């Protein structure tokens, strides 16, 4: 599995 | 022994040439098994290994789940380019790259040895998850912004929860499904070729072909003395069939063969090999 | 932070004239990722050419394998042509069956 969402984050 | 699940992300901008691109691939040791390309029309996570194309029914939602996860990553890094760009105050006329590599290392007992998550910007270290899987190291001041955002969002804990959780388990499931490919040690097919240059000098080339995994050792010696400095050693290359190649050549005098043994060591060999012309 | 590619041209199996094989061009150690790789048969571009998915090494530099099926002869010279931002002119590496 690719690690999931990132919850629409932003570096 | 020890096995690893590793994911690689590359996202880069192309101004005046469309919108940013995001490509990602997955590997179990030295054998890819999955890919994702944001340029595709309706970008899906696609299998890239034989055991992924036939025994991936155990979970009927694998491909949809990974498709959405990969699309979310694509948008995250697409916007992140704009972020890193703002932090450095770089011009949008330029192309820039964000790379990520994360995954897990499992030991012979099936338990996690180490997890890791690292990010680079324009090919240089940008930010990394520390060994404790609880804090971040930012390479410069601009990456401090990413560190602050990720700390205040509590990202490190979800990172650790993936690395110690889904990563280990999916490494085990892949090792089981593809043990015919993954749990193999194909020894190299080795031979020496002979290429004259003059009436005075000859090239001897020692070939190791079609071996897996990628790690191998190839050395020449003259009557028993190593010749690493004199010999030419090309970087291990893939053969396109899921295996690897390597050779090592040396220029020796004409008639001075029958010395100069070649020596091959690889974990698929019962014993190390010694070849001589 | 730019890096020029290394090139290797080689066949998947040992060269045997008149038998089917795969011609390979391996480019590695380059950065950024955009790169132009063409496979040449007697100086002319081969149409049916595919490549592996983009990946990178521990030092973050990229590598790629371009490949196409071919059957070598005595007379047919094959090569690989690579251009990159770090290259002021494209590099050409001929296929040597002894390498």
Residue numbers in the entry:
A (entry chain C): 1 to 11
B (entry chain A): 1 to 277
C (entry chain B): 1 to 99
Study authors write:
Major histocompatibility complex (MHC) class I molecules (MHC I) present antigen peptides to the surface of antigen presenting cells (APCs) to active T cells through interaction with T-cell receptors (TCRs), which play pivotal roles in antiviral defense. In this study, we screened bat MHC I Ptal-N*01:01–binding peptides from different bat-borne viruses (HeV, EBOV, MERS-CoV, and H17N10) and determined the structures of bat MHC class I complexed with these viral peptides. The overall structures of Ptal-N*01:01 display the common characteristics of classical MHC I molecules in other mammals, with the extracellular region of the heavy chain folding into three different domains. The α1 and α2 domains construct a typical PBG that contains two α1-helices and eight β-sheets, and the α3 domain and β2m display typical immunoglobulin (Ig) domains and underpin the peptide binding domain.
To verify the uncommon peptide presentation features of bat MHC I, we determined the crystal structures of Ptal-N*01:01 in complex with the two HeV-derived peptides, HeV1 (DFANTFLP) and HeV2 (DYINTNVLP), two EBOV-derived peptides, EBOV-NP1 (DFQESADSFL) and EBOV-NP2 (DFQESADSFLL), one H17N10-derived peptide, H17N10-NP (DFEKEGYSL), and one MERS-CoV-derived peptide, MERS-CoV-S3 (DFTCSQISP). Although having different lengths, the 8-mer peptide HeV1, 9-mers HeV2 and H17N10-NP, 10-mer EBOV-NP1, and 11-mer EBOV-NP2 in the PBG of Ptal-N*01:01 all display an M-shaped conformation, with P2 and PΩ residues as the primary anchors and the P5 or P6 residue as the secondary middle anchors. Detailed analysis indicated that Asp59, Arg65, and the P1-Asp of the peptides in all six structures of Ptal-N*01:01 form a triangular network of hydrogen bonds.
